[PDB]
Amino acid sequence: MTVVPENFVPGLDGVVAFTTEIAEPDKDGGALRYRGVDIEDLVSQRVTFGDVWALLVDGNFGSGLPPAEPFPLPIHSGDVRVDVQAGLAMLAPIWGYAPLLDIDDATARQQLARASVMALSYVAQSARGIYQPAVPQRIIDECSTVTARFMTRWQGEPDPRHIEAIDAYWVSAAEHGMNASTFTARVIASTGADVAAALSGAIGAMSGPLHGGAPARVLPMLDEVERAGDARSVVKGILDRGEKLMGFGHRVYRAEDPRARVLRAAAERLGAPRYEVAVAVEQAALSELRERRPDRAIETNVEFWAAVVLDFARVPANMMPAMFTCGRTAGWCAHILEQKRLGKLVRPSAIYVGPGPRSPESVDGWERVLTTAG
Amino acid sequence: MTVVPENFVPGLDGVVAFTTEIAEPDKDGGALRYRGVDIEDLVSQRVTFGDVWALLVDGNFGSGLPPAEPFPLPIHSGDVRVDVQAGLAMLAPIWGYAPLLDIDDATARQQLARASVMALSYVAQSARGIYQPAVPQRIIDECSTVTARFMTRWQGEPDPRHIEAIDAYWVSAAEHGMNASTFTARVIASTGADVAAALSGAIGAMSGPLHGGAPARVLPMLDEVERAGDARSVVKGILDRGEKLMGFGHRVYRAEDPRARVLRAAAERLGAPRYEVAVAVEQAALSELRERRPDRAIETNVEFWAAVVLDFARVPANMMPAMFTCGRTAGWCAHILEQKRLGKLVRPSAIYVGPGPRSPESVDGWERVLTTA
C-alpha cells in the first residue's frame, strides 16, 4: 500500500472476479445464452419468466418461481425502488432468513424464490399506489403465470397482450453477466449475509443512472414523429439541434443486440401501436448516424425497443427502471446461489496515496476542535 | 469471456481496485492512520467520533458531524441492522436526495453527514426499542457531542465513562480500507446512485458474519472464567471440546492489531470491571493456541477487546454488530465521497465456463414447461 503500479487503472475493468456457469453474453458471436439456451429460443417459444428464473437459478427446467404469498407492502416512500429495497431487507426477520453461511443450498434456493417473487409483488403494489384499494387475492389467484399475477396485482384487469409483452421483456432482461448490481449482490452474498440483504443491496446499485440498461427516454421523440410524420427529418433535426439520439449508439454485440431483436419482434407480433413509427425512427436513426459517422459502428440499443414494449404494456416512464429490476432478479438470484457455493469473501485492496504520518495538531481545523470542545 | 487466466483466483484478494487518500491500515507497521493521523493519537487525545468523521471525509477538522434532527424511526423489524438498512434507503425520497451523478461535491457531503448521524439515531431508537417512550429531544439537546447524544437517545441517562468507551471504540472502528462493506458502498456509489442507497447497501454487506470485525461472542467465555476462576483451564476445555475459541486467530497486522491495543488500553483506563478477567483470558488463549499450533502466527482479534469495551458501556451482545456499523459510517461516507470524485463505474469481468449452445428441449425438465401458442 504505497506506490501506484505502472499505469494502473482505477476500477476493475477487465479484472476477472469469477467464473460462472449461469449465462454467456457472447458479444463476438451475436448471441445471448442462459445456461446454454439462446434467449431467442426462450422468447420465441414463449417460455414464461417464472420458468426462465428457474433455468437460470438451477441450470434446468421444472421448479418455476412460485406465486407470491399475500403481504401488503409496508413501505410507501414515493419511490418504487426505495419501497422494494427497504421492503426486501425487512423480509429476513419476519420470515426467519438466517445468514447464507448458516443454511444449506436448497434452503437458500427456496428463500431466493420466495423473496424474488415478493419483489415483484412489492413493485406491483407500489406502482398501483395507496390512493386506491388493493386488488383482491382471489382475482390474482385466477392467473396461471407469475407474470399474469404481477400485472393483475398492479392493474386489476390487464390486457393479455400486455402480459405477453412483459414476459418477453423480463426474459430478455433476466441476466447479463457481471454488471454493478449483479456484482453487488455477489459481494453482499460473499459476506454470508442473508439473501434478502443481498437482493436489497443489489436494488440500490441498480438504481444508479450509470448502472446502464434501464429503458430509454425515447417516448418524446416517438411522439414528435407521430405528429410531424417525417421520421428522417425529425432525426436530422434531433441531430442538427446538437441533441443526441436516444436509444442508439456504439455496438454492444457484433451487430444487432439479440435482446433488441427479440423486443422489436415482440412489439411487431403483439401489434404495439407505436411499432410502425419506432421501426421508422430506427431505420432513420441508423442510416442517419451511420451516414454522418461512416467509420463508427452504430446499432440500436435494447433500451430503445424496451421502452416501446414497456410503454405498450401501460408501464409509465417513471416505472420502467423497476420493470428492468423485476426481470433482473432472476440473474441476481442465480448469482447469489452460485456465490454461496463459491464460498469466497470478495475483499479487494487499495493503494494509499494520502498524507504521511502527522500529529492531530498539524491538521487544518484543529483550532475549531479545541474551540468547539472548549 | 471463456478462457480462464493463469493467475485467476476466485474473488479479488490483493487486486488493487483504487487509490485512496482516506486512510492507511499499515499491516506491516502495526499502525492504523486516518489521513496520516494515528488512531492511538486520536483516541488518547479524546478526539470525539463526530470530529474524526470530518477528518476522514474532508481531510481536515473544519466541520464536525452535526446532530441528528428529530425523526422517529419508521421501521420496527425486530433487527436493528434491518431497521437502519431499510430506514436509511427511505431517507432519499423524503429528504429529496438526488442521484450522486446530479449533485456537486458539497451537496453530497452535506447529504452524507445528515444521513450518517440519522443512522446513529436510528440504531439508538431501535436498540431502545418500542416498549419504551422516546427520550425527549430537549434532554438529548443538553449533550455536547454526537456520541453523547446517541448514548442519551438510547439510554436516557448514560454513564459518562460509558460515553468515553463508545467514543474510543467508534474512533477505532471508523475506517479500515477496502473491506467488503466499504467496497459495496463504493460500488453502489460508482453507479451514480444517491448516497442513502449506497449507505443502505453497505449495511447489507456489513451484516454478513464473514465480513469480519463484529465483536466476538466472548461473553459466555468471560462469564465462565469469572465463575470458575481459572482462565487457562477454561480455554483448554473449549479447545478440548473441539469448539472454536472466539476472539483469536490469524494475525491481521504483522503482530498485534493496533485497534486491539487501543481498546485494551481504553478498557484499562476506564476501569471496566471485566478488564482483568479479559487480560487473563488473552494470556491463556494465546499461550494455548501458540502451544498447539507453534508455527502459526496467532494474534488477538480486535473483536475480542471490542466486545469488552461495548459490554462495559452496557451494549447488549445482539446490539454489538450495529455499534460497529455506527462507527464505520465515517469510512463509508469518506469513501462514497472519494468514489464520487473519481467518477468511474466499478464493474469487473467474469469468465463463462458453463454449458455450450444447446436447444431448450435438451435441458432436463423441458417436458414440465408449459407454453401457450
Side-chain angles (χ1 to χ4, degrees), chain A residues 1-2 4-5 8-216 218-223 225-226 228-235 237 239-240 242-243 245-275 277-282 284-290 292 294-295 297-313 315-374, chain B residues 1-2 4-216 218-226 228-243 245-253 255-292 294-295 297-313 315-373:
Chain A
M1 206 181 198
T2 283
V4 199
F8 138 94
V9 309
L12 302 168
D13 283 1
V15 175
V16 182
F18 314 105
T19 63
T20 182
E21 293 177 279
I22 288 164
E24 182 184 14
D26 188 354
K27 309 285 190 54
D28 287 329
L32 176 59
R33 281 178 299 263
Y34 292 172
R35 300 283 191 171
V37 183
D38 201 299
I39 56 159
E40 297 190 278
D41 290 329
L42 291 179
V43 171
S44 78
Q45 301 216 48
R46 299 167 196 198
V47 185
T48 194
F49 172 68
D51 281 329
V52 165
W53 189 103
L55 168 70
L56 277 163
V57 168
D58 296 330
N60 48 76
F61 292 116
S63 309
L65 208 52
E69 69 207 79
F71 198 145
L73 168 60
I75 306 309
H76 324 289
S77 64
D79 184 332
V80 55
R81 180 272 302 180
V82 171
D83 291 354
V84 175
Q85 188 170 2
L88 278 200
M90 297 163 61
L91 297 171
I94 181 167
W95 283 355
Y97 281 17
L100 273 170
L101 176 63
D102 297 339
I103 60 181
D104 59 23
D105 291 353
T107 307
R109 198 279 188 198
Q110 192 35 64
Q111 290 178 356
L112 287 162
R114 194 187 174 183
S116 204
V117 73
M118 188 60 61
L120 314 184
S121 165
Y122 281 175
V123 172
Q125 294 185 61
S126 186
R128 189 179 171 78
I130 63 187
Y131 306 89
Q132 62 183 313
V135 175
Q137 188 56 44
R138 86 201 138 71
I139 293 187
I140 302 169
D141 282 340
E142 289 171 350
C143 299
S144 60
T145 63
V146 169
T147 307
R149 294 186 171 246
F150 171 86
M151 296 296 277
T152 312
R153 190 182 296 275
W154 170 26
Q155 299 172 352
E157 297 159 351
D159 187 320
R161 285 154 71 247
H162 299 178
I163 296 166
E164 287 190 63
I166 297 312
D167 237 350
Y169 175 68
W170 277 354
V171 169
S172 83
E175 156 66 16
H176 210 241
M178 203 31 71
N179 50 76
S181 65
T182 292
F183 182 52
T184 289
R186 297 194 62 138
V187 172
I188 295 158
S190 89
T191 69
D194 71 75
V195 299
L199 293 164
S200 169
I203 292 156
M206 176 61 88
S207 75
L210 288 177
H211 185 282
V218 299
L219 299 170
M221 185 190 314
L222 300 182
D223 294 303
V225 181
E226 170 69 10
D230 191 322
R232 267 316 277 267
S233 297
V234 177
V235 170
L239 291 175
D240 281 328
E243 298 185 329
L245 280 184
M246 304 294 252
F248 301 89
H250 72 81
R251 85 168 175 195
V252 181
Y253 287 77
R254 200 74 176 275
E256 222 182 355
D257 183 327
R259 303 168 295 173
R261 164 160 69 268
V262 147
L263 295 173
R264 181 197 308 109
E268 196 285 321
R269 168 179 80 79
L270 299 171
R274 292 194 194 268
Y275 174 81
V277 162
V279 145
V281 174
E282 193 185 23
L286 295 169
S287 54
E288 195 54 54
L289 286 160
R290 290 166 177 180
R292 295 264 204 80
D295 301 330
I298 298 140
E299 308 288 339
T300 316
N301 300 355
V302 51
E303 294 75 36
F304 174 89
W305 288 109
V308 185
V309 169
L310 292 177
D311 175 67
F312 168 60
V315 177
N318 48 50
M319 191 197 161
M320 294 185 178
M323 293 299 287
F324 186 28
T325 284
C326 283
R328 187 47 55 81
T329 63
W332 292 349
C333 287
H335 278 277
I336 284 158
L337 188 57
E338 183 174 71
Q339 183 64 46
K340 176 190 198 294
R341 300 189 171 114
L342 182 60
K344 172 75 196 187
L345 176 75
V346 182
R347 205 281 182 203
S349 293
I351 293 298
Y352 180 77
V353 299
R358 50 169 180 170
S359 65
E361 294 85 354
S362 76
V363 182
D364 300 313
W366 178 253
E367 173 67 18
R368 199 281 308 154
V369 173
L370 308 182
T371 291
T372 293
Chain B
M1 165 98 220
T2 67
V4 186
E6 297 195 354
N7 73 328
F8 171 74
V9 293
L12 293 165
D13 282 7
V15 176
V16 184
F18 308 104
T19 62
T20 185
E21 293 175 315
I22 292 155
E24 186 190 8
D26 182 352
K27 304 287 185 47
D28 293 317
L32 177 56
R33 279 179 296 271
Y34 297 163
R35 303 280 188 175
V37 189
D38 200 302
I39 64 162
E40 299 185 88
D41 292 333
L42 291 171
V43 167
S44 68
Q45 298 196 40
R46 300 182 189 189
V47 188
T48 195
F49 176 66
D51 288 329
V52 169
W53 191 102
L55 173 68
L56 286 163
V57 171
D58 305 317
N60 64 76
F61 289 116
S63 178
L65 185 69
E69 64 209 82
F71 196 145
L73 171 68
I75 306 307
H76 316 286
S77 70
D79 188 327
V80 179
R81 181 273 301 179
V82 172
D83 292 351
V84 64
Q85 190 175 350
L88 282 192
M90 292 169 65
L91 295 176
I94 187 178
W95 288 350
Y97 282 15
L100 270 169
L101 181 59
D102 300 346
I103 61 190
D104 58 20
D105 291 1
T107 301
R109 197 274 186 198
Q110 180 167 38
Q111 292 180 353
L112 285 163
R114 185 186 182 189
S116 210
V117 74
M118 192 55 62
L120 308 191
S121 176
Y122 282 173
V123 167
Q125 298 179 59
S126 181
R128 180 180 180 78
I130 68 173
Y131 300 103
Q132 296 197 86
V135 174
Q137 189 63 49
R138 45 176 179 83
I139 292 182
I140 306 170
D141 283 349
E142 284 151 3
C143 306
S144 45
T145 66
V146 167
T147 301
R149 287 178 180 257
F150 169 90
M151 293 297 275
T152 302
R153 187 180 297 281
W154 169 26
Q155 301 180 351
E157 283 148 60
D159 191 311
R161 288 153 75 237
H162 303 170
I163 294 180
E164 293 187 63
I166 300 311
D167 241 354
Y169 170 73
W170 276 356
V171 163
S172 86
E175 157 64 21
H176 209 252
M178 211 37 65
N179 50 86
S181 65
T182 290
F183 185 51
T184 300
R186 293 198 67 132
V187 167
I188 302 177
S190 83
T191 72
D194 70 70
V195 297
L199 290 168
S200 179
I203 292 170
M206 180 63 104
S207 79
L210 295 178
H211 178 288
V218 292
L219 284 181
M221 176 176 54
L222 299 183
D223 275 314
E224 183 51 33
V225 176
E226 172 74 352
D230 185 290
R232 188 58 166 268
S233 164
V234 175
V235 161
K236 268 169 138 68
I238 294 167
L239 298 171
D240 285 348
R241 293 193 300 277
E243 314 165 27
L245 207 58
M246 305 322 303
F248 306 86
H250 205 255
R251 47 120 88 99
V252 175
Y253 288 70
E256 180 171 45
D257 191 317
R259 306 170 293 173
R261 181 183 328 120
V262 159
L263 297 175
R264 180 193 308 111
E268 187 282 329
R269 185 184 74 84
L270 293 175
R274 290 194 192 261
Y275 180 64
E276 279 182 29
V277 156
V279 182
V281 168
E282 187 178 357
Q283 191 280 330
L286 294 166
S287 280
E288 192 61 41
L289 288 174
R290 290 158 180 175
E291 266 204 318
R292 295 193 181 202
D295 303 307
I298 296 164
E299 306 289 343
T300 302
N301 297 339
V302 60
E303 296 93 315
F304 179 83
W305 282 109
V308 172
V309 172
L310 295 166
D311 172 70
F312 168 65
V315 177
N318 66 345
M319 176 176 187
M320 292 187 176
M323 293 302 284
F324 184 25
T325 290
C326 285
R328 183 53 53 84
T329 62
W332 292 345
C333 287
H335 276 274
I336 288 161
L337 188 61
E338 189 171 71
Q339 188 59 43
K340 183 203 191 303
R341 300 184 170 114
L342 186 62
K344 171 65 183 184
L345 174 72
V346 176
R347 76 101 89 196
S349 313
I351 297 296
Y352 183 73
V353 297
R358 57 172 179 178
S359 64
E361 63 264 25
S362 80
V363 184
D364 278 356
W366 177 247
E367 80 280 359
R368 321 240 305 150
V369 179
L370 287 187
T371 61
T372 76

XYZ file of all heavy atoms in Angstrom, chain B residues 250-309, unseen atoms left out:
466
model
N -5.818 -15.829 13.089
C -4.721 -15.344 12.265
C -4.463 -13.858 12.518
O -5.389 -13.077 12.768
C -5.029 -15.589 10.786
C -3.811 -15.684 9.921
N -3.418 -14.669 9.073
C -2.903 -16.676 9.768
C -2.319 -15.033 8.436
N -1.986 -16.247 8.839
N -3.183 -13.484 12.478
C -2.795 -12.081 12.523
C -3.460 -11.308 11.389
O -3.499 -11.775 10.246
C -1.271 -11.967 12.422
C -0.660 -12.808 11.301
C 0.111 -11.987 10.270
N 1.517 -11.798 10.630
C 2.524 -12.525 10.146
N 2.291 -13.502 9.277
N 3.770 -12.276 10.530
N -4.009 -10.136 11.708
C -4.471 -9.206 10.675
C -3.365 -8.237 10.293
O -3.107 -7.997 9.111
C -5.735 -8.451 11.144
C -6.138 -7.389 10.114
C -6.880 -9.422 11.396
N -2.710 -7.664 11.297
C -1.487 -6.912 11.096
C -0.320 -7.894 11.209
O -0.522 -9.104 11.342
C -1.419 -5.743 12.086
C -2.411 -4.631 11.757
C -3.793 -4.816 11.920
C -1.975 -3.411 11.263
C -4.696 -3.816 11.604
C -2.878 -2.395 10.938
C -4.235 -2.597 11.109
O -5.117 -1.588 10.781
N 0.916 -7.392 11.117
C 2.072 -8.279 11.250
C 2.041 -9.001 12.594
O 2.070 -10.237 12.650
C 3.369 -7.487 11.085
N 1.953 -8.240 13.690
C 1.707 -8.782 15.022
C 0.377 -8.271 15.576
O -0.694 -8.567 15.037
C 2.854 -8.408 15.966
N 0.439 -7.487 16.644
C -0.773 -7.034 17.312
C -1.564 -6.094 16.406
O -0.992 -5.268 15.691
C -0.407 -6.342 18.632
C -1.586 -5.820 19.430
C -1.197 -5.332 20.822
O -0.188 -4.617 20.960
O -1.900 -5.689 21.791
N -2.883 -6.261 16.401
C -3.774 -5.301 15.744
C -3.765 -4.024 16.577
O -4.039 -4.089 17.787
C -5.191 -5.873 15.635
C -6.103 -5.055 14.729
O -6.104 -3.804 14.796
O -6.835 -5.677 13.939
N -3.432 -2.860 16.002
C -3.328 -1.651 16.834
C -4.654 -1.242 17.435
O -4.668 -0.585 18.484
C -2.798 -0.594 15.856
C -3.277 -1.061 14.511
C -3.178 -2.570 14.578
N -5.765 -1.602 16.783
C -7.089 -1.350 17.337
C -7.345 -2.224 18.558
O -8.017 -1.795 19.504
C -8.159 -1.594 16.271
C -7.926 -0.810 14.984
C -8.866 -1.268 13.876
N -8.580 -2.633 13.438
C -9.323 -3.324 12.574
N -10.415 -2.782 12.042
N -8.979 -4.570 12.250
N -6.840 -3.462 18.543
C -6.902 -4.288 19.742
C -6.123 -3.642 20.879
O -6.593 -3.611 22.019
C -6.376 -5.696 19.452
N -4.939 -3.100 20.575
C -4.148 -2.393 21.577
C -4.917 -1.205 22.135
O -4.935 -0.982 23.350
C -2.813 -1.933 20.972
C -1.884 -1.184 21.945
C -0.592 -0.677 21.250
N -0.192 -1.581 20.174
C -0.085 -1.239 18.893
N -0.293 0.011 18.511
N 0.269 -2.147 17.993
N -5.560 -0.428 21.258
C -6.263 0.773 21.711
C -7.448 0.411 22.608
O -7.671 1.036 23.652
C -6.699 1.616 20.500
C -7.844 2.561 20.882
C -5.511 2.395 19.974
N -8.216 -0.606 22.228
C -9.381 -0.973 23.023
C -8.975 -1.608 24.352
O -9.615 -1.357 25.374
C -10.290 -1.900 22.225
C -10.880 -1.263 20.966
C -11.682 -2.264 20.135
C -11.748 -0.091 21.347
N -7.905 -2.412 24.370
C -7.425 -2.940 25.644
C -7.042 -1.811 26.580
O -7.347 -1.854 27.778
C -6.224 -3.871 25.447
C -5.689 -4.459 26.780
C -4.325 -5.115 26.645
N -4.299 -6.097 25.569
C -3.628 -5.946 24.428
N -2.911 -4.848 24.196
N -3.676 -6.899 23.512
N -6.391 -0.775 26.044
C -5.999 0.352 26.880
C -7.199 1.200 27.295
O -7.214 1.750 28.400
C -4.957 1.200 26.147
N -8.206 1.325 26.430
C -9.424 2.028 26.817
C -10.119 1.319 27.974
O -10.551 1.961 28.940
C -10.366 2.153 25.615
N -10.217 -0.008 27.900
C -10.856 -0.771 28.962
C -10.097 -0.632 30.280
O -10.714 -0.558 31.353
C -10.970 -2.237 28.545
N -8.759 -0.586 30.222
C -7.972 -0.400 31.441
C -8.137 1.013 31.982
O -8.396 1.209 33.178
C -6.494 -0.698 31.174
C -5.573 -0.699 32.413
C -5.198 0.696 32.912
O -5.110 1.627 32.089
O -4.995 0.866 34.134
N -7.982 2.011 31.110
C -8.101 3.405 31.527
C -9.445 3.689 32.196
O -9.519 4.482 33.141
C -7.912 4.320 30.316
C -7.898 5.795 30.652
C -7.798 6.676 29.402
N -9.051 6.739 28.645
C -10.058 7.569 28.926
N -9.973 8.407 29.956
N -11.154 7.557 28.180
N -10.521 3.066 31.716
C -11.855 3.404 32.190
C -12.313 2.543 33.358
O -13.403 2.781 33.885
C -12.863 3.301 31.041
C -12.635 4.364 29.966
C -13.556 4.164 28.780
C -12.791 5.770 30.542
N -11.512 1.567 33.773
C -11.874 0.709 34.887
C -12.997 -0.255 34.571
O -13.871 -0.481 35.416
N -13.004 -0.821 33.376
C -14.014 -1.810 33.050
C -13.874 -2.986 34.005
O -12.774 -3.556 34.127
C -13.888 -2.279 31.599
N -14.937 -3.363 34.716
C -14.802 -4.436 35.718
C -14.291 -5.744 35.139
O -13.572 -6.478 35.827
C -16.230 -4.575 36.282
C -16.890 -3.254 35.970
C -16.300 -2.800 34.670
N -14.623 -6.056 33.889
C -14.174 -7.307 33.288
C -12.740 -7.252 32.771
O -12.289 -8.235 32.173
C -15.087 -7.696 32.122
C -16.503 -8.139 32.465
C -17.057 -8.802 31.209
N -18.490 -9.057 31.251
C -19.025 -10.234 31.550
N -18.241 -11.254 31.851
N -20.343 -10.387 31.556
N -12.029 -6.133 32.958
C -10.703 -5.972 32.360
C -9.768 -7.115 32.725
O -9.130 -7.717 31.853
C -10.066 -4.652 32.790
C -8.693 -4.445 32.187
C -8.539 -4.308 30.808
C -7.550 -4.393 32.985
C -7.296 -4.121 30.239
C -6.289 -4.205 32.423
C -6.176 -4.065 31.040
O -4.960 -3.870 30.442
N -9.651 -7.411 34.014
C -8.605 -8.325 34.448
C -8.904 -9.756 34.031
O -8.000 -10.489 33.615
C -8.414 -8.209 35.955
C -7.548 -7.016 36.304
C -7.297 -6.888 37.778
O -7.299 -7.937 38.477
O -7.095 -5.732 38.223
N -10.162 -10.175 34.129
C -10.515 -11.496 33.628
C -10.249 -11.575 32.127
O -9.820 -12.615 31.611
C -11.976 -11.823 33.983
C -12.551 -12.846 33.020
C -12.039 -12.346 35.412
N -10.458 -10.463 31.410
C -10.275 -10.475 29.962
C -8.797 -10.556 29.583
O -8.433 -11.305 28.672
C -10.940 -9.251 29.346
N -7.931 -9.818 30.287
C -6.486 -9.955 30.088
C -6.028 -11.378 30.400
O -5.184 -11.941 29.691
C -5.712 -8.917 30.932
C -4.222 -9.031 30.670
C -6.170 -7.500 30.607
N -6.561 -11.977 31.473
C -6.158 -13.335 31.837
C -6.564 -14.329 30.757
O -5.829 -15.278 30.465
C -6.770 -13.733 33.188
N -7.731 -14.122 30.147
C -8.148 -14.970 29.036
C -7.247 -14.753 27.824
O -6.883 -15.711 27.129
C -9.624 -14.707 28.692
C -9.993 -15.358 27.348
C -10.517 -15.204 29.829
N -6.862 -13.501 27.552
C -5.992 -13.248 26.408
C -4.666 -13.989 26.568
O -4.248 -14.738 25.678
C -5.771 -11.743 26.223
C -5.010 -11.438 24.930
C -4.792 -9.956 24.662
O -5.269 -9.116 25.453
O -4.116 -9.639 23.657
N -4.026 -13.844 27.731
C -2.795 -14.583 28.007
C -2.997 -16.090 27.866
O -2.150 -16.786 27.290
C -2.277 -14.239 29.415
C -0.865 -14.752 29.723
C -0.856 -16.215 30.090
O -1.832 -16.732 30.643
N 0.230 -16.898 29.770
N -4.088 -16.622 28.420
C -4.269 -18.074 28.407
C -4.591 -18.570 27.007
O -4.132 -19.644 26.606
C -5.366 -18.477 29.387
N -5.357 -17.782 26.241
C -5.753 -18.185 24.899
C -4.562 -18.182 23.951
O -4.325 -19.161 23.238
C -6.859 -17.263 24.377
N -3.800 -17.088 23.927
C -2.638 -17.026 23.045
C -1.600 -18.076 23.423
O -0.929 -18.636 22.550
C -2.020 -15.625 23.073
C -2.856 -14.482 22.495
C -2.269 -13.133 22.890
C -2.928 -14.608 20.976
N -1.452 -18.366 24.720
C -0.469 -19.370 25.120
C -0.886 -20.760 24.652
O -0.069 -21.511 24.107
C -0.258 -19.356 26.637
O 0.604 -18.304 27.013
N -2.160 -21.114 24.840
C -2.611 -22.445 24.449
C -2.635 -22.594 22.929
O -2.237 -23.637 22.393
C -3.988 -22.734 25.061
C -4.436 -24.195 24.960
C -3.509 -25.168 25.680
O -3.040 -24.850 26.789
O -3.244 -26.260 25.131
N -3.060 -21.547 22.214
C -3.114 -21.618 20.757
C -1.719 -21.673 20.144
O -1.487 -22.406 19.170
C -3.899 -20.430 20.208
C -5.403 -20.514 20.457
C -6.070 -19.231 20.020
C -6.002 -21.716 19.725
N -0.775 -20.903 20.689
C 0.581 -20.955 20.158
C 1.309 -22.222 20.579
O 2.245 -22.637 19.888
C 1.366 -19.708 20.576
C 0.886 -18.436 19.887
C 1.288 -17.195 20.673
N 0.847 -15.954 20.044
C 1.001 -14.749 20.586
N 1.573 -14.631 21.778
N 0.571 -13.664 19.949
N 0.906 -22.845 21.692
C 1.441 -24.162 22.036
C 0.990 -25.200 21.019
O 1.797 -25.981 20.502
C 0.988 -24.577 23.442
C 1.932 -24.260 24.602
C 1.711 -25.185 25.810
O 0.546 -25.482 26.162
O 2.712 -25.637 26.407
N -0.303 -25.197 20.699
C -0.900 -26.214 19.845
C -0.563 -26.027 18.369
O -0.432 -27.020 17.645
C -2.417 -26.220 20.051
C -2.821 -26.643 21.460
C -4.306 -26.945 21.544
N -4.706 -27.336 22.894
C -5.798 -28.043 23.173
N -6.593 -28.451 22.194
N -6.096 -28.346 24.426
N -0.433 -24.788 17.894
C -0.064 -24.502 16.506
C 1.206 -23.655 16.528
O 1.167 -22.438 16.293
C -1.206 -23.810 15.762
N 2.359 -24.275 16.792
C 3.545 -23.499 17.208
C 4.175 -22.671 16.106
O 4.900 -21.713 16.410
C 4.519 -24.578 17.701
C 3.708 -25.847 17.807
C 2.597 -25.726 16.829
N 3.938 -23.007 14.844
C 4.489 -22.251 13.733
C 3.433 -21.420 13.012
O 3.695 -20.923 11.912
C 5.192 -23.201 12.765
C 6.290 -24.005 13.441
O 7.166 -23.390 14.088
O 6.266 -25.254 13.351
N 2.249 -21.263 13.601
C 1.200 -20.416 13.049
C 1.201 -19.075 13.771
O 1.326 -19.022 14.997
C -0.178 -21.078 13.169
N 1.085 -17.994 12.999
C 1.053 -16.640 13.546
C -0.341 -16.363 14.096
O -1.312 -16.269 13.338
C 1.427 -15.617 12.480
N -0.436 -16.217 15.413
C -1.709 -16.142 16.119
C -1.720 -14.878 16.972
O -0.821 -14.679 17.799
C -1.928 -17.397 16.988
C -2.021 -18.639 16.096
C -3.166 -17.246 17.842
C -1.860 -19.944 16.828
N -2.733 -14.028 16.773
C -2.868 -12.765 17.498
C -4.283 -12.617 18.044
O -5.203 -13.363 17.685
C -2.514 -11.565 16.603
C -1.124 -11.668 15.946
C 0.018 -11.484 16.932
O -0.235 -10.971 18.044
O 1.169 -11.839 16.592
N -4.453 -11.655 18.947
C -5.779 -11.355 19.477
C -6.584 -10.593 18.428
O -6.089 -9.626 17.849
C -5.682 -10.529 20.761
O -4.920 -11.240 21.740
C -7.085 -10.225 21.327
N -7.817 -11.030 18.179
C -8.686 -10.283 17.277
C -9.131 -8.986 17.938
O -9.386 -8.941 19.143
C -9.911 -11.110 16.890
C -9.553 -12.369 16.130
O -8.474 -12.476 15.555
N -10.472 -13.324 16.110
N -9.222 -7.921 17.140
C -9.764 -6.671 17.662
C -11.147 -6.899 18.246
O -11.514 -6.274 19.246
C -9.794 -5.581 16.571
C -10.671 -6.015 15.384
C -10.302 -4.289 17.162
N -11.922 -7.815 17.649
C -13.269 -8.101 18.121
C -13.288 -8.527 19.583
O -14.320 -8.392 20.240
C -13.914 -9.195 17.267
C -14.137 -8.826 15.815
C -12.981 -9.237 14.903
O -11.796 -9.008 15.282
O -13.274 -9.792 13.806
N -12.178 -9.075 20.093
C -12.139 -9.528 21.479
C -12.254 -8.346 22.433
O -13.088 -8.345 23.344
C -10.850 -10.314 21.749
C -10.716 -10.790 23.171
C -11.330 -11.964 23.586
C -9.996 -10.058 24.098
C -11.219 -12.407 24.902
C -9.875 -10.501 25.414
C -10.485 -11.675 25.811
N -11.436 -7.320 22.222
C -11.473 -6.161 23.093
C -12.641 -5.236 22.762
O -13.124 -4.523 23.648
C -10.120 -5.447 23.037
C -9.106 -6.185 23.891
C -8.033 -6.922 23.462
C -9.121 -6.300 25.320
N -7.382 -7.477 24.540
C -8.023 -7.103 25.689
C -9.957 -5.793 26.324
C -7.734 -7.406 27.018
C -9.670 -6.096 27.636
C -8.570 -6.897 27.974
N -13.125 -5.259 21.515
C -14.369 -4.569 21.183
C -15.507 -5.051 22.062
O -16.231 -4.245 22.655
C -14.715 -4.776 19.705
N -15.671 -6.375 22.171
C -16.739 -6.932 22.998
C -16.633 -6.458 24.442
O -17.647 -6.151 25.074
C -16.713 -8.456 22.937
N -15.414 -6.399 24.981
C -15.234 -5.980 26.365
C -15.610 -4.513 26.536
O -16.295 -4.138 27.499
C -13.783 -6.252 26.807
C -13.509 -5.656 28.184
C -13.498 -7.759 26.790
N -15.165 -3.662 25.609
C -15.440 -2.233 25.705
C -16.937 -1.966 25.560
O -17.525 -1.198 26.331
C -14.610 -1.462 24.658
C -15.028 -0.025 24.605
C -13.128 -1.545 25.001
